[PDB]
Amino acid sequence: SFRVALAGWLYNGVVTTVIDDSSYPKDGGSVTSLENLWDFFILALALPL
Amino acid sequence: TQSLVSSMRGTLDKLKLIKSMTPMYLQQLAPVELAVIAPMLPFPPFQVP
DSSP sequence for B21-47 = -HHHHHHHHHHHHHHHHGGG-SS----
The answer to whether A48 touches A37, Cβ cutoff 8 Å, is no
The answer to whether A40 touches A24, Cβ cutoff 8 Å, is no
The experimental method, as deposited, was cryo-EM
A13 secondary structure, DSSP code: T
The answer to whether A24 touches A35, Cβ cutoff 8 Å, is no
Question: Looking at beta carbons, which residues of chain B come within 8 Å of A21?
Answer: 1-2
H or E element in which residue A44 lies: helix A34-46
* Cβ within 8 Å, pair B1-A16: no
CA B47 to chain centre: 21
Q: What is the resolution in angstroms?
A: 3.0
The answer to whether A37 touches A31, Cβ cutoff 8 Å, is yes
Burial of A29 from C-beta contacts in 10 A (0-12 / 13-18 / 19+): middle
Please tell me the total number of residues recorded for chain B in this structure.
49
How many CB atoms sit inside 10 A of residue B21's CB? 8
* Cβ within 8 Å, pair A21-B1: yes
